[PDB]
Amino acid sequence: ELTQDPAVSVALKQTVTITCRGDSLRSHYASWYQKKPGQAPVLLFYGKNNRPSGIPDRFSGSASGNRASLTITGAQAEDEADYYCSSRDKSGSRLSVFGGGTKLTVLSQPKAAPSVTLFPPSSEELQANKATLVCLISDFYPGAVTVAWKADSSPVKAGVETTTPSKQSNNKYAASSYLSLTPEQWKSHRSYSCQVTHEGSTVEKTVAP
Amino acid sequence: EVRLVESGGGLVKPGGSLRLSCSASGFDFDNAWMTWVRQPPGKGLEWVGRITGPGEGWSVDYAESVKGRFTISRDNTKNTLYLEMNNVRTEDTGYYFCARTGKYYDFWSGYAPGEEYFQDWGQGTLVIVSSASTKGPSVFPLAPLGCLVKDYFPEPVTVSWNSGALTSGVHTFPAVLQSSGLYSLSSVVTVPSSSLGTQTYICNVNHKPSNTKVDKKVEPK
């Protein structure tokens, strides 16, 4: 009912506008919330030009037509978060809804390519009639990767579990992807590959029985 | 000075029942509108419901996804707000927040429909609706090096190398939550290639919920 772009990135001290769209906004105000992992959401803006005290002046809102926008003029590193619009779900209704949410990435580090390590199934695991390949990804920035698995240059579309990237101590990111396989498939193919794509550049590691 | 504190979260099986509570101080709780909001891990915020004050007869509205299963009530004498969850499903998993709800409206001009905004929040309480049982990990070596800690519930596990002697170059990756409802993680250490034969590298895995302690030696094929 309320739709926002899932992801946007801004450079430090630059200006970014996060927009919420929906039919209810033609007649209803929207409120705006900042959400960081492990912390309660924070009200940033509501109604017609209302900013709670304690919210820095770089946050401001606007509205026209069927859209509502939150603008950050001069993004800071601490502004990296998820941002949600909220409004009535429709006219004549007592219910409220949140938009899908926008993950704002504030580019606070130089771009860094991921280091990828791929491990084959253990001999002990195979003796247990199981096989898993472990694709470990570390030291990349920003924190977004796409992982693709290939079975002899053929895409594998089952048995893949991938983490969302999590911040390392050195402010780069790490992630992991696991491919579950029967021992038969692991020996039915000559090689298996983990393809990590980051910022348009692909890093591939390969293992074989 | 405004304080909100949620409690009552925990592990519940599908179909079970749960009562969350949110205690409040620092404002006129008795007359305040109060809203429940939830967030599934990794997903967006979801409006659950809201209980009004005296001016609206203490009426309650619910999201359709919880209507008929959740009930919101208040005990003004105790400054406590409640969310009763019955017949919970896996989709009910998430952090649950209570929010003091403001009203943006001008009674005397009537120029706009009233807006509810959430100005103060508690820290949240975590509810996990999972049918998963306590399960110890299977620990597999990752040959040249690391350790694979597979299929455990619940979090956490602890991984150390050489009984804590090897702390340099050790990267323990965050666990993955699989569709099965079980966790897996890997811990990898970077070592000198020449030191392989000289030094024996063992990883220590501890999973206290399952009374599982595994020491796995990692060595080349």
Author numbering:
A (entry chain L): 3 to 9, 11 to 95, 95A, 95B, 95C, 96 to 209
B (entry chain H): 1 to 52, 52A, 52B, 52C, 53 to 82, 82A, 82B, 82C, ...
The authors write:
Antibody 10E8 is one of the broadest monoclonal antibodies thus far identified that effectively neutralizes diverse strains of HIV-1. Overall, our results show how a conformationally dynamic cis-proline and the interaction between the CDR H3 and the CDR L1 of 10E8 appear to provide exactly the requisite degree of structural plasticity needed for a highly hydrophobic surface to recognize an MPER epitope.
We tested the influence of the di-proline motif in the CDR H3 of 10E8v4 on its SEC and HIC profiles by mutating prolines at positions 100f or 100g to alanine. To define the structural basis for the anomalous SEC and HIC behavior, we determined the crystal structures of 10E8v4 with Pro100f to Ala (10E8v4-100fA) in two different space groups, Pro100g to Ala (10E8v4-100gA) and Pro100f and Pro100g to Ala (10E8v4-100fgAA) variant at 3.7 Å, 2.4 Å, 2 Å and 2.7 Å resolutions, respectively. After rigid body refinement, the CDR H3s (95TGKYYDFWFGYPPGEE YFQD102) of the variants were defined clearly in their Fo-Fc maps contoured at 3σ. Extensive hydrogen bonding networks were observed between the CDR H3 and the CDR L1 of 10E8v4, involving heavy chain residues, Tyr98, Ser100c, Pro100g, Gly100h and Glu100i, and light chain residues Ser30, Tyr32, Lys51 and Arg91. However, these hydrogen bonds were not retained in the Pro to Ala variants, suggesting the YPP motif to be critical for coordinating these hydrogen bonds, and disruption of these hydrogen-bonding interactions correlated with the degree that the CDR H3 conformations differed from that of wild type, their reduced binding affinities, and their reduced neutralization potencies. Part of the data presented here favors the Masiero et al. proposal, as we found the P100gA mutation to reduce affinity to gp41 and neutralization potency substantially and the P100fA variant to retain reasonable neutralization potency against viruses tested.
